[PDB]
Amino acid sequence: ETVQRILLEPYKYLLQLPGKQVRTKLSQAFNHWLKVPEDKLQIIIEVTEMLHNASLLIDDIEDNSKLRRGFPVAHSIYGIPSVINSANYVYFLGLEKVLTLDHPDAVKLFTRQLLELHQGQGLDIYWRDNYTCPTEEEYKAMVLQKTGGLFGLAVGLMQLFSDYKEDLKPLLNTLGLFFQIRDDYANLHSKSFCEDLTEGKFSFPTIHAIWSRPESTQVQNILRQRTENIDIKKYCVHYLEDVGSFEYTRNTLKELEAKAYKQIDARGGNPELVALVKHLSKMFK
Amino acid sequence: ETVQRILLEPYKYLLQLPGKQVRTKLSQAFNHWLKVPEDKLQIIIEVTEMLHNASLLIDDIEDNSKLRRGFPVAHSIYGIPSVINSANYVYFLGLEKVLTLDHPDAVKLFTRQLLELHQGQGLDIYWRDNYTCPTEEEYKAMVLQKTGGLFGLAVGLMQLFSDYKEDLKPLLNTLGLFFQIRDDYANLHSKSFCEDLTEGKFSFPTIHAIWSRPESTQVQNILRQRTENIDIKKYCVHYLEDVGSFEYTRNTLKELEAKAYKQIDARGGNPELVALVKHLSKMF
Amino acid sequence: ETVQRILLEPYKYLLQLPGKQVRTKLSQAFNHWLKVPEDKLQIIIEVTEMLHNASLLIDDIEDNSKLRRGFPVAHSIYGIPSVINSANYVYFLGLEKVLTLDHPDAVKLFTRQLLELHQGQGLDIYWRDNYTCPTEEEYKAMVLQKTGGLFGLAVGLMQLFSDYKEDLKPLLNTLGLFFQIRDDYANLHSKSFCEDLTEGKFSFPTIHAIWSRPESTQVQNILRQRTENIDIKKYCVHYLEDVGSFEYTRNTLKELEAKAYKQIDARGGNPELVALVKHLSKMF
Amino acid sequence: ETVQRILLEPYKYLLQLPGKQVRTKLSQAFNHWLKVPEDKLQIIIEVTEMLHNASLLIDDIEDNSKLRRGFPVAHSIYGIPSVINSANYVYFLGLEKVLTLDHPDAVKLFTRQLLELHQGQGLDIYWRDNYTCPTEEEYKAMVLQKTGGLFGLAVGLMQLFSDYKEDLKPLLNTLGLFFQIRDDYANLHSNKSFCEDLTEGKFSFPTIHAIWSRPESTQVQNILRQRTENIDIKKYCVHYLEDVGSFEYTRNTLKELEAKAYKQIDARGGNPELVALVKHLSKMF
Amino acid sequence: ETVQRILLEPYKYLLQLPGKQVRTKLSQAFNHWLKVPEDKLQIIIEVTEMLHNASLLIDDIEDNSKLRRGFPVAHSIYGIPSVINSANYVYFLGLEKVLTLDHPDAVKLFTRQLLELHQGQGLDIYWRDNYTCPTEEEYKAMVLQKTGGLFGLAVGLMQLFSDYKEDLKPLLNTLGLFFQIRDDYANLHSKSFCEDLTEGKFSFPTIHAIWSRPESTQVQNILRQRTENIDIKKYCVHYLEDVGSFEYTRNTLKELEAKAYKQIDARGGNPELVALVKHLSKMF
Amino acid sequence: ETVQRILLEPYKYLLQLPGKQVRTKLSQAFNHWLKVPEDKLQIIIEVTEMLHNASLLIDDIEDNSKLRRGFPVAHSIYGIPSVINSANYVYFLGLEKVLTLDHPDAVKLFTRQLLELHQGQGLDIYWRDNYTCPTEEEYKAMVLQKTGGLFGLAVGLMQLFSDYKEDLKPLLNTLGLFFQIRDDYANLHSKSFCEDLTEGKFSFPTIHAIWSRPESTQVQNILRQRTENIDIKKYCVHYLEDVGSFEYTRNTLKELEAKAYKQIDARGGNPELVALVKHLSKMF
Ligand SMILES: CC(C)=CCC/C(C)=C/CC/C(C)=C/CC/C(C)=C/COP(=O)(O)OP(=O)(O)O
Ligand SMILES: CC(C)=CCC/C(C)=C/CC/C(C)=C/CC/C(C)=C/COP(=O)(O)OP(=O)(O)O
Ligand SMILES: CC(C)=CCC/C(C)=C/CC/C(C)=C/CC/C(C)=C/COP(=O)(O)OP(=O)(O)O
Ligand SMILES: CC(C)=CCC/C(C)=C/CC/C(C)=C/CC/C(C)=C/COP(=O)(O)OP(=O)(O)O
Ligand SMILES: CC(C)=CCC/C(C)=C/CC/C(C)=C/CC/C(C)=C/COP(=O)(O)OP(=O)(O)O
Ligand SMILES: [Mg+2]
Ligand SMILES: [Mg+2]
Ligand SMILES: [Mg+2]
Ligand SMILES: [Mg+2]
Ligand SMILES: [Mg+2]
Ligand SMILES: [Mg+2]
Ligand SMILES: [Mg+2]
Ligand SMILES: [Mg+2]
Ligand SMILES: [Mg+2]
Ligand SMILES: [Mg+2]
Ligand SMILES: [Mg+2]
Ligand SMILES: [Mg+2]
């Protein structure tokens, strides 16, 4: 049974990548409130990691990405077919691990949240490949489905074993939108160079440019080319800057940071979470 | 939420393709022993259909196929990204259907059987993409995992609601192997022309041809070309025929048919299932 | 200047293709009413030939076609750069020839009709390449511009030298739509097999299918694949038939043919033209 | 009819590029001689601009170019099919504009000049794509038809509304060559990306010289045939042009031409604004 | 050393292909005059085959060919790198075999002929890939280098051990040209469909079409495309036929056959060769 | 015959590359021992040069390389077919020059060494393209055949006209390995960036990485990609450094260097060759 080794090799590859430090901080922060017992908390952490990583392996294939956090994407080393099988294998390894929580609502919640993630991803993929730019409201809505999938899996499972009956769903929605838009910004403003444009996807900045200059189809046409061409990409970033789309993403990110601090105090404060949000906000201005 | 409609369009497309008749027949066949109550049986039939199709959606991306049962492969119409997301989605819709059985071991078994399916696909993919031809025993072993995933799911779930506690795994193993090698044989002997050679996969007839003639590295090299060229395929089938690898697969399918019947009689017989196995065996 | 020979070779090649006997019948059919003097009429006949062929040479590059009227498309032999320059050269040889009519409103009309052609094609290309399926009204609208460009050029230049001042634009619009929709139908129902589906374009049958079954985005996605794959094409033609798109197209064509006859008897009859219209109608 | 907006978008995209400044200067300079009424002169400039730009849009497609004056080429944003049609439309917008001059010979001359432009491009494309290298005299001969197409249109139309009876074709020929050869040098020696002319496979002045100058080598012909984007082959190729003296040869041709333009300007009684432009454009070598 | 088996597999693959039966018939034909001992003659036949086959392996890589004598070309199965090394290896096995003749001129001749073979191939490729169509006299002269390379090795080695010193080079030239031009005609008239067009090579009929019709650059342009499109090829074969290229080649082949009979009868006749040339000539 | 000009162009090109200066310093180093008369020695150096260059022309095609010693590979300028022919031609021009030595064992040795070389080459190719990584010892064995091919031809031919009967093959083997492994290290540790990974080849450092960490299939999968992607290459190089493969290669090269010195002292010393080896060692 070194079948398991071969099957999990693409996953193990991805564990080299950065990302666990922030996932750890989030669990610790939210456990400040939920006060979940050590044994259940670790199964929940393990499970979160597996599903998150499983879904990143798949997103990279859906998105024809080249790098992730400075590293080549699993499937550019091992191939698409091996990575798909492996990611899916790992999803069901997660489900197996969830059953070790031995709580009758755990699998019910796991299903709900994985169904929600797939709706978020579905829409993203749908808009891109059928060339229908979403409205800003549509976009935010699917980001809450995408990111609320894993956000709400983690805190939902924790809640099964917590006495903390205050409402976190609003705060999770803010942090979801925050991570995603922050990501959308980073990708086009500083993964390799402007991958989101090669992907052809509609991210926060490109959406803004599209609706801000409706006589133009320039961004749409560029996204449709799925181009690796550095000069086209450069021209496009120059264009978003002119139309004020980076500006508008910056301000959207400042408001979401404000709201996060507002929502955290509403729950009595959480210094560790404020620290992480302040640290993650460094990446504008 | 006409989003649901969009997310399931690849799945709905695939429900047009032939297949249900034989999945339906098996369910009736096994329920002659298992005698599952009607409300639980439909939930099971629905769940089997979803997971089976979902895995086909993916297998075709994994395998780069062009046709399935005479239809274009889903992703050749809606694109890979969409089809992956939609197959994975239906997996979970399947999990959610399974919770409605309201049996404490249903999920446990569901999990076990998918892990297996995936351990089986893993190896198929691994050997193909890393150019390690499996031995016949290794090949058979993973088929039992690949097919055993779903066969064992359908029947495992049924047994949760049954007082038939006899062991059906040996029979499922034979059926699994029978379906797969049948498949393998049809593919290269009668999907479009020899898709398995274009996929580069090791199937029963080529596994035999490789180990049978170790002077020659010719079939390995042809697989590795992942070619659509019909003249290369024709040459290859001609070689498989000459080394008697189609004869060998026929004699393996004949042994399996006959083992099916003996494992069915060991269980108290089943006309319905013997009909299915005889009907499927006309192909050799 | 045997440069003239190299520059014009692509155009010369295109003149081996069928299509003149139709252009000639129309010329004669309208001249029944217009009764243009021979000297002017021959110049017009030549101008219409140059501009039409020049525009087809470009359409084939725009549309990525492989064959026209059973013959390889010009650029497939001579390459795209040489064809673009050649077609454009011929446009201006067209203009130079229009100048030999010596009618002050000649160039003015010529300019207007070519601008109109480019509007129709501009929309065709746009919808296709930015993936926006037109409503049926929108589509008819651009066909009128596309076909009307050269239809109206030929008859326009003729009417400058005629005493026949009755209005032919309604009849030409009916003839425009008729030729195009007929084209659209023959392309998908009987150029190589279903080239329009490989082009990715939206044609009358595919337009119907898309608004007729709004749950399904299937035709959109096939058009988006720009595929040569014969099975996808077969699958698509099967769907258009199931949803009633070919029937629908055949009805539109019938109403237009009817309307053609009404607009001809509106003008005082034209047996040469009713002949061409009945002949071209045999196709459905 | 927003149809015109879609039609004109690629053309509008090209109008962002540099190039108008030099066109404006030449119009002013030749009007020192031709003294064309400003009503007519505006119309002529607008027509010059339309046809010039339309012909670049097309040339970029013909020449598989990636940049022009530092910008992506229109067809790389909007697709080949859209820009062919857009460009062709603009040609006929051009014709329509020319008719607003109300001169019975305006269109005759329009036609004559585009037909000549088209002969020039024809030979350019032909030699490249049928792998026949032209002689230097052959090349110069076509450059006069290509560049003389548009020069002769601007100045020919102007002459329709002028009493200036002195002959300008020789000076325009000299300018034709100067601009084109200057281009050919800049392209390989220094807007367009690295050595695009090599990737095109075209026979330009320095390659032409290097081919006949060393008939025992077929290495330049063969590199041009490869249509390569490989930066090493291109670097290798420019080394060879420099070793064989093709860049020195081009520089002296360009000096000879600059001298001729000054002598020819002087025969027409001087033109300080044209000398300013020639002198400015000569800094380049 | 099972390295040898792997090293030689591509070569052994090609030994399945038709082509031996003629090479033998020839050897027998010339031994009718040269009367070589059968210990030397066998070693010579073995050297002929090795160098011919090895040179065909390379020619198929050079010419991007898909089939040879109905079979897939070696490198389409084993990959170019392996076949390049395998062919070169067999060249030096050939020289190894040549040394076992112990003739002190064997190697001098061996070298002259391969050097000559390579100057012919070199010219074929140079014209093709730098797009310079050769004149008819230029073509024929390289065909004499290309075919005479091997023809002149077989017979030149045989003559080292013969008391027959009457000159055979004029007959070997006639034969060389007879074989190649027969080939060129079969390719474009009856390997899969018109591969010589896909290759882009200038063959005897394409050469006639080009110079015969110097206004047209249609055949040059089609060859430059390096296309697999059945229609462009079809169109092309039609053009060659209309321009009379196929007639012209039939007559050139007729005249060589006659010149073959006169040069054989010049040498005292040779029924067994008049037999093969007759047999061959049936094809026009 | 300007034929020889065209045919030799790819060769003549490659002579622009650095590499002679080492080949000349080797000749002199060994001629300190062998003391070969000058007319014979010049012929040997020319023969060495031709066959070494001809073989590099083929290697670059086999290995799908872009650069060699900072210049473009021949076939990227002239195309693959022309270089294949030009390379093989030079081989036989080399056989011809060999015959000018007038030694009855010259062609026998020539043949033995080229055969030897093609055996090494074929194995490198075999492993790469059939995805069987060799063992360190296997690899070392084929390197001896590959490099020994040419090394042994130079020194073997020199020895035919030498009174020096001491055994050199142990020192040639040490050098052969030294040269190749030093190449394998440069290639990955400092040709464009890590061309070896794009090629897919198993070179000393990657072989170490593969066996050093058998749970991982990461280096194999990377090599399988035949990638140009700089990020995958960078990743890979970091991985090799983490597994200690560059240290490992460095210590092997240090062992080979010191062995060389022992072997040279065994033969009486050779300052010129010590100086050469010392210089080549500055690179680790
Ligand atoms: C509640 C606690 C303690 C932890 C939860 C921490 C987790 C699991 C966070 C994940 C939230 C998130 C950002 C999910 C998105 C996953 C996903 C499907 C990403 C793909 O989005 P893209 O838009 O394609 O961008 P990338 O390709 O750059 O990832
Ligand atoms: C027995 C009862 C009660 C019901 C039916 C049980 C089911 C669903 C049986 C089907 C089992 C089966 C044959 C599963 C295989 C699934 C799979 C991933 C196949 C992939 O096979 P390939 O070797 O890639 O060939 P195909 O891509 O053409 O399928
Ligand atoms: C009435 C008289 C005197 C003459 C007739 C004048 C002519 C030539 C009329 C032809 C009208 C017509 C059918 C015009 C369409 C021209 C065009 C640009 C067609 C290309 O559009 P597609 O829709 O791609 O058609 P294809 O299917 O050939 O590609
Ligand atoms: C005389 C007045 C008042 C105005 C003239 C201003 C104009 C329109 C000048 C045009 C001069 C010129 C250089 C024309 C060339 C047009 C053409 C078809 C260029 C394309 O040639 P390429 O060799 O492909 O070079 P580029 O692609 O680098 O442009
Ligand atoms: C006079 C003396 C003492 C020696 C002769 C000098 C010569 C000719 C030395 C050459 C020995 C040598 C290192 C040969 C290598 C032959 C070959 C075809 C190598 C190719 O191997 P790759 O691994 O592909 O490496 P490269 O592509 O970097 O060359
Ligand atoms: Mg995504
Ligand atoms: Mg992504
Ligand atoms: Mg499979
Ligand atoms: Mg499959
Ligand atoms: Mg069209
Ligand atoms: Mg078309
Ligand atoms: Mg140009
Ligand atoms: Mg250009
Ligand atoms: Mg050949
Ligand atoms: Mg050939
Ligand atoms: Mg090598
Ligand atoms: Mg190499």
PDB file of N, CA and C in Angstrom, chain C residues 220-236:
ATOM      1  N   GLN C 220     -24.541  27.453 -27.983  1.00  0.00           N
ATOM      2  CA  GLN C 220     -23.542  28.480 -27.703  1.00  0.00           C
ATOM      3  C   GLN C 220     -22.174  27.864 -27.495  1.00  0.00           C
ATOM      4  N   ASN C 221     -22.086  26.876 -26.605  1.00  0.00           N
ATOM      5  CA  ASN C 221     -20.808  26.266 -26.237  1.00  0.00           C
ATOM      6  C   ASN C 221     -20.143  25.495 -27.400  1.00  0.00           C
ATOM      7  N   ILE C 222     -20.952  24.834 -28.236  1.00  0.00           N
ATOM      8  CA  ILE C 222     -20.407  24.177 -29.434  1.00  0.00           C
ATOM      9  C   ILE C 222     -19.829  25.189 -30.418  1.00  0.00           C
ATOM     10  N   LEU C 223     -20.594  26.246 -30.704  1.00  0.00           N
ATOM     11  CA  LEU C 223     -20.098  27.338 -31.545  1.00  0.00           C
ATOM     12  C   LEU C 223     -18.799  27.898 -30.999  1.00  0.00           C
ATOM     13  N   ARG C 224     -18.737  28.078 -29.678  1.00  0.00           N
ATOM     14  CA  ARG C 224     -17.531  28.567 -28.995  1.00  0.00           C
ATOM     15  C   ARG C 224     -16.298  27.647 -29.135  1.00  0.00           C
ATOM     16  N   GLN C 225     -16.493  26.337 -29.272  1.00  0.00           N
ATOM     17  CA  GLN C 225     -15.366  25.407 -29.494  1.00  0.00           C
ATOM     18  C   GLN C 225     -14.659  25.543 -30.861  1.00  0.00           C
ATOM     19  N   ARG C 226     -15.251  26.262 -31.812  1.00  0.00           N
ATOM     20  CA  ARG C 226     -14.692  26.349 -33.181  1.00  0.00           C
ATOM     21  C   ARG C 226     -14.134  24.988 -33.646  1.00  0.00           C
ATOM     22  N   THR C 227     -14.952  23.936 -33.549  1.00  0.00           N
ATOM     23  CA  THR C 227     -14.466  22.564 -33.754  1.00  0.00           C
ATOM     24  C   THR C 227     -14.563  22.002 -35.190  1.00  0.00           C
ATOM     25  N   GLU C 228     -13.586  21.182 -35.554  1.00  0.00           N
ATOM     26  CA  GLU C 228     -13.652  20.443 -36.814  1.00  0.00           C
ATOM     27  C   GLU C 228     -14.335  19.112 -36.567  1.00  0.00           C
ATOM     28  N   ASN C 229     -14.436  18.706 -35.296  1.00  0.00           N
ATOM     29  CA  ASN C 229     -14.929  17.378 -34.890  1.00  0.00           C
ATOM     30  C   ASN C 229     -16.311  17.040 -35.452  1.00  0.00           C
ATOM     31  N   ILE C 230     -16.328  16.053 -36.344  1.00  0.00           N
ATOM     32  CA  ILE C 230     -17.532  15.627 -37.090  1.00  0.00           C
ATOM     33  C   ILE C 230     -18.687  15.151 -36.161  1.00  0.00           C
ATOM     34  N   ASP C 231     -18.343  14.501 -35.055  1.00  0.00           N
ATOM     35  CA  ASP C 231     -19.344  13.994 -34.125  1.00  0.00           C
ATOM     36  C   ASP C 231     -20.070  15.095 -33.371  1.00  0.00           C
ATOM     37  N   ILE C 232     -19.330  16.108 -32.938  1.00  0.00           N
ATOM     38  CA  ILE C 232     -19.946  17.275 -32.327  1.00  0.00           C
ATOM     39  C   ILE C 232     -20.880  17.907 -33.376  1.00  0.00           C
ATOM     40  N   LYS C 233     -20.406  18.048 -34.612  1.00  0.00           N
ATOM     41  CA  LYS C 233     -21.244  18.656 -35.631  1.00  0.00           C
ATOM     42  C   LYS C 233     -22.517  17.825 -35.830  1.00  0.00           C
ATOM     43  N   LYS C 234     -22.353  16.512 -35.986  1.00  0.00           N
ATOM     44  CA  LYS C 234     -23.508  15.614 -36.115  1.00  0.00           C
ATOM     45  C   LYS C 234     -24.463  15.813 -34.932  1.00  0.00           C
ATOM     46  N   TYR C 235     -23.903  15.886 -33.730  1.00  0.00           N
ATOM     47  CA  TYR C 235     -24.719  16.002 -32.523  1.00  0.00           C
ATOM     48  C   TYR C 235     -25.517  17.295 -32.539  1.00  0.00           C
ATOM     49  N   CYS C 236     -24.860  18.340 -32.999  1.00  0.00           N
ATOM     50  CA  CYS C 236     -25.476  19.641 -33.086  1.00  0.00           C
ATOM     51  C   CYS C 236     -26.633  19.714 -34.104  1.00  0.00           C
TER      52      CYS C 236
END
